[PDB]
Design a protein around this ligand. Structure first.
Ligand SMILES: *C(=O)CCCCCCCCCCCCCCC
Lengths: 179, 146, 221, 191, 210, 184
């Protein structure tokens, strides 16, 4: 039951805060900027905290591959078919903040190879690995929709705030099925 | 001999050429040389008149106009391009036009125009200044015209 | 001419042939008016279709008598004399003559020549005249303006002694003249592009300045 | 209130002990979390301004590193579009580090980044350890705006800040232009 | 050297006399070589061309005219060529044909042709519900439920779609049918990505038809 | 399968296709009007097309690498393999070849066997020695490989339209700038 999403372009700075809640509206718009930038900074600073046991010897390039959850999305745009993809894929942020679990919610993180970050706040609290496997697939559907409807846009400067209706209605359709 | 031309919607030529038969290779003697553009411009009016009518094929018009022994034939493509030509005697005859040779001649010349129209640098107003096009048209004339 | 669009159709060869027959018939009748008026059109519009033989023939036959009989009181193109450059010569050392000088914040970096003459230093006026036609004409004399007249003019006796300036068939031939000065200006920059010329013993007609392509190349003194 | 059209990241980079914490404390939208400088490396200030009808949001990140912050302090300039080099006219040591600071800034941050240079605490006229003339000459050699500030000498930093943003806008503003229906019954002509 | 050379006039060519040049375009046929590619490339070219016109223009009218002119250079080349393919009934292509598609010389025939063949070529599916408004005097219109080219363009306003408007404008203009074609947006049917290209013909054609 | 059958499957059934005569006619219209706008200054035409391609690529790198999500390339070999066999394969039906690896392994050449952009083209006679027609390809290549933090230079040395039989794209890696996000 994902309740909110938000995406950070390449160097901090919120660019999307469409909240998927019935009626909460507790948090001001301004403070989400500090939220997103603080998440970016914590992502950066957790990188230099790998314990020295695994710093010099990882030997774990078999778990980075992520399995294929069949129909996480629904039931298209540039993509076509029953689903955006069929094969499994690989993790890109292998030494960064992936999850922040909490009594009332859970924040999943999905980092694009170029540098984009996608953040999914979900009220639902899944052995803390199956949750990541659902979340990474779903956030990559969101990333595919982003590349479809924000990159192929004339009136959109690079790494700037997102202001569109196709994108927000499409991701709303994506999430209202995922519950 | 023969004198063939390709003309656009603004009533300017994008191509003109003249074919002999090697018996009298000077072509039309001296006066019809001056008179070819004006007789063809005259025939253009009848070609335009038949351009918009009902009545089967209607791209090939055949013998449309007459003059002092000159048979004037015309073919209309889709952009208003008019392929018009005049056939003259061999200095004495009652010259007649073939019904299929000139048909296929216009078919392939329209093929050439269609494929040389596509390139982005060619405008409708500018002429077809292409040695390859000229060579292809004249080797077609050798094969079909006579 | 009204049936065609001499002044919907762009058959230039056909238009040229009609204009040729028009001038020929106009000379066949004793009418020196439309012969001139159509020869001007023919050798201002369709100048890049007539070969050298026909251009020379037409100029010697139908335009030259139009010059002699005061039928045309102007020139054909306005595109003559592309370049109008001017300079001053330092005959002596540079020190001989010099130009007078005429006597808690915030900084931000994120944010043509004016010709000068003292009063009488010998100047140099070089103008490049372009002939587009296939025949060669001659310039009779040159004059400047009315607004900047009697200020920095070229010397009439100098041009007269220099004589008629022939210009070749297709050339961009240059003409260099001296230039006298007889008045100050204080502080009022004045433009120089009016530039009256006579061509083939015609009245002195104004000609503006046109660069390679339309942009008016103005310099000021 | 997502009415701002653009969001510009600017770093209030400067030497330790310069009084930059008091510098940005004047011009503020001070609310929410504070004292985050030691939490990771940064504290945040924001403002919305009107620039010929295009609302612009600013993000002042005040990076600081004492002895341990080596990699992330540089990584915070991943896409910084403005810089606000803070120095103090009280000691030559603070001004001596400006060359290194600019070198790191140009090496890491966005290519052709707008940089201003602010001298905090100019009220103190007893220990002027660097002249404004030399400071201006240094400012000339890099195409970078200069100013000096004080509590009593107010509005200088504010006008310099606004002029910095409107200077950046001219660089990273792609020109945007503000880009009888048939009503009645219908008849189908499809074959 | 042996070109047309329109200044000098028609050169004299002897029929009996023949050495062809490798043009590389006249030799290459144009039958129907299918080389279909991804929609992503078309969309990216579309948005970048819109952005470049967006910089170059100064007002909505300038953007209007510039994009219409850009699309006008595709209809000119489509009108001849698409009809020429349709003339083929199932090396020089002309030795596989006996007769052509006639001329679609009527208003209904040309508009039906754009409904059927042109759109099926462009977007791989026939357009829906061609209509004429029998209210003012004449207002033809072709409606699309989901325009492929401008699908990614957001905003309730419709001005970046005039590429197709220019395509139809050229297609009708070169066929002897001047027009004032213009697009409009109207949700009717639950789609809301529904766009009507209104074709408004000229008085010359209005007198010609009757 | 390393890349061949992978990219073949991706293009087979994951992509919404469209006719490419529309694509080439559109690009032809753009490059035709560019000449008229710039008054036949074909060097500036090439520069403008280079900017066009760079602006394409800066966005295009988010479509590819989301439609496939390949692992991060290491050094100049797997990157060339994907760039030849999958990157061009997804967006067009062309599989250009790789040739003349340099001695130091710092440069390579794409042979474009087919160029659907330049389908029906003859440059004017006065521009068959300056105008690189498909400069947008070099622009998008440079933009994409710069945005993957694999900064390099890309240019033409021969094209089918101008003379030589083979059509080339030389790609030389300048330096792998080590500012690729925190950990990727
Ligand atoms: C290893 O680091 C992976 C690098 C991936 C590079 C992707 C290259 C994309 C180029 C495709 C060009 C298609 C042409 C589109 C024209 C509109």
């Amino acid at each position: 039951a994902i309740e909110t999403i938000l995406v950070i372009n390449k160097s901090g700075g919120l660019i999307y805060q469409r909240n998927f809640t019935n009626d909460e509206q507790k948090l001001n718009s301004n403070e989400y900027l500090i939220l997103a930038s603080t998440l970016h900074g914590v992502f950066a600073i957790a990188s230099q905290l790998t314990p020295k046991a695994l710093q010099l010897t990882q030997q774990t390039n078999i778990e980075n591959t992520i399995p294929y959850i069949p129909y996480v999305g629904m039931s298209l745009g540039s993509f076509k078919g029953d689903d955006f993809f069929k094969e499994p894929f690989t993790n890109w942020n292998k030494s960064g903040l992936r999850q922040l679990c909490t009594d009332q919610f859970t924040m999943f993180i999905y980092q694009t190879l170029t540098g984009l970050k996608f953040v999914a706040i979900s009220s639902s609290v899944s052995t803390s690995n199956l949750a990541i496997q659902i979340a990474d697939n779903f956030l990559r559907k969101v990333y595919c929709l982003y590349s479809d409807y924000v990159m192929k846009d004339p009136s959109y400067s690079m790494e700037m705030p997102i202001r569109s209706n196709l994108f927000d209605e499409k991701v709303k359709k994506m999430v209202e099925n995922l519950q | 001999p023969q004198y063939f031309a390709i003309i656009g919607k603004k009533d300017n030529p994008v191509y003109e050429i003249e074919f002999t038969n090697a018996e009298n290779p000077q072509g039309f003697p001296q006066d019809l040389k001056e008179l070819n553009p004006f007789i063809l411009h005259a025939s253009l009016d009848i070609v335009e008149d038949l351009q918009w009518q009902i009545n089967t094929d209607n791209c090939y018009l055949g013998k449309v106009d007459h003059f002092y022994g000159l048979a004037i034939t015309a073919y209309i493509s889709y952009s208003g391009m008019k392929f018009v030509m005049i056939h003259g005697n061999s200095a004495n005859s009652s010259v007649v036009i073939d019904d299929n040779n000139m048909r296929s001649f216009y078919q392939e010349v329209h093929e050439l125009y269609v494929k040389t129209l596509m390139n982005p640098f060619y405008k409708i107003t500018d002429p077809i200044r292409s040695p390859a096009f000229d060579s292809r048209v004249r080797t077609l004339a050798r094969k079909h015209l006579s | 001419i009204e049936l065609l669009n001499i002044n919907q159709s762009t058959w230039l060869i056909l238009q040229k042939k009609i204009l040729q027959l028009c001038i020929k018939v106009s000379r066949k009748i004793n009418d020196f008016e439309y012969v001139a008026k159509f020869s001007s059109i023919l050798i201002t519009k369709y100048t890049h279709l007539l070969n050298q033989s026909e251009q020379d023939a037409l100029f010697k036959e139908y335009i030259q008598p139009s010059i002699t009989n005061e039928s045309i009181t102007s020139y054909w193109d306005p595109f003559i004399l592309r370049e109008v450059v001017i300079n001053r010569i330092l005959d002596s050392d540079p020190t001989s003559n010099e130009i007078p000088l005429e006597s808690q914040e915030v900084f931000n970096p994120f944010k043509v020549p004016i010709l000068v003459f003292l009063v009488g230093d010998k100047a140099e006026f070089t103008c490049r005249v372009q002939n587009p036609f296939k025949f060669d004409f001659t310039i009779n004399d040159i004059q400047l303006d009315e607004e900047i007249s009697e200020f920095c003019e070229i010397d009439r006796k100098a041009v007269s002694y220099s004589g008629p300036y022939n210009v070749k068939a297709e050339s961009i031939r240059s003409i260099t003249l001296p230039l006298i000065i007889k008045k100050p200006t204080y502080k009022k920059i004045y433009e120089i592009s009016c530039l009256k010329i006579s061509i083939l013993k015609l009245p002195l007609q104004k000609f503006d300045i046109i660069n390679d392509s339309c942009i008016y190349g103005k310099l000021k003194i | 209130g997502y009415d701002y059209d653009y969001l510009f990241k600017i770093v209030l980079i400067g030497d330790s002990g310069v009084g930059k914490s008091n510098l940005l404390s004047r011009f503020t939208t001070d609310e929410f979390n504070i004292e985050s400088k030691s939490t990771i490396g940064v504290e945040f200030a924001t403002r919305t301004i009107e620039v010929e009808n295009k609302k612009i949001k600013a993000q002042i990140w005040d990076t600081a590193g004492q002895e341990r912050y080596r990699a992330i302090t540089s990584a915070y300039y991943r896409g910084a579009v403005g810089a606000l080099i803070v120095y103090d006219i009280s000691k030559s040591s603070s001004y001596e580090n400006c060359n290194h600071w600019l070198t790191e800034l140009r090496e890491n941050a966005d290519d052709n980044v707008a940089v201003g240079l602010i001298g905090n605490k100019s009220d103190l006229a007893h220990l002027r350890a660097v002249p404004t003339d030399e400071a201006k000459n240094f400012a000339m050699e890099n195409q970078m705006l200069f100013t000096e500030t004080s509590a009593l000498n107010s509005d200088n930093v504010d006008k310099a800040f606004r002029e910095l943003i409107v200077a950046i806008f001219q660089m990273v503003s792609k020109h945007q232009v503000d880009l009888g229906a048939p009503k009645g019954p219908t008849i189908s002509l499809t074959p | 050297s042996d070109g047309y050379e329109y200044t000098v006039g028609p050169k004299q060519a002897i029929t009996s006399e023949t050495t062809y040049i490798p043009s590389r375009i006249y030799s290459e046929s144009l039958l129907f070589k299918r080389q279909e590619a991804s929609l992503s490339a078309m969309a990216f070219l579309f948005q970048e061309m819109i952005s470049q016109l967006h910089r170059t223009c100064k007002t909505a009218g300038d953007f209007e005219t510039k994009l219409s002119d850009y699309g006008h250079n595709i209809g000119i080349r489509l009108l001849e060529l698409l009809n020429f393919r349709a003339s083929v009934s199932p090396e020089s292509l002309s030795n596989y044909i006996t007769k052509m598609r006639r001329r679609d010389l009527k208003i209904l025939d040309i508009l039906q042709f754009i409904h059927g063949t042109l759109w099926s070529y462009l977007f791989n599916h026939v357009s829906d519900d061609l209509v004429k408004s029998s209210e003012r005097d004449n207002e033809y219109m072709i409606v699309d439920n989901f325009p492929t080219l401008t699908q990614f363009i957001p905003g309730e306003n419709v001005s970046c779609e005039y590429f197709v408007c220019g395509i139809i404008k050229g297609f009708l203009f070169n066929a002897g049918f001047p027009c004032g074609v213009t697009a409009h947006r109207m949700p009717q049917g639950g789609h809301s990505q529904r766009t009507v290209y209104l074709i408004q013909f000229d008085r010359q054609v209005l007198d010609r038809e009757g | 399968r390393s890349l061949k059958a992978m990219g073949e499957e991706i293009w087979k059934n994951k992509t919404e296709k469209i006719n490419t005569e529309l694509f080439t006619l559109t690009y032809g219209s753009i490059v035709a009007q560019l000449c008229q706008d710039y008054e036949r200054d074909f060097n500036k035409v090439n520069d403008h097309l280079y900017s066009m391609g760079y602006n394409i690529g800066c966005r295009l790198i988010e479509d590819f690498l989301a439609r496939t999500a390949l692992p991060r390339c290491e050094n100049l070999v797997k990157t060339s393999e994907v760039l030849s066999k999958c990157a061009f394969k997804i967006f067009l039906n062309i599989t250009p070849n790789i040739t003349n690896w340099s001695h130091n392994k710092d440069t390579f050449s794409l042979i474009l066997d087919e160029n659907p952009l330049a389908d029906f083209v003859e440059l004017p006679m006065d521009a068959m020695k300056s105008l690189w027609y498909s400069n947008i390809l070099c622009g998008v290549l440079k933009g994409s490989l710069e945005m993957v933090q694999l900064d390099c230079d890309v240019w033409f040395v021969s094209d089918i339209l101008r003379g030589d039989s083979q059509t080339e794209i030389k790609v030389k890696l300048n330096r792998i700038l080590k500012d690729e996000i925190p950990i990727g």
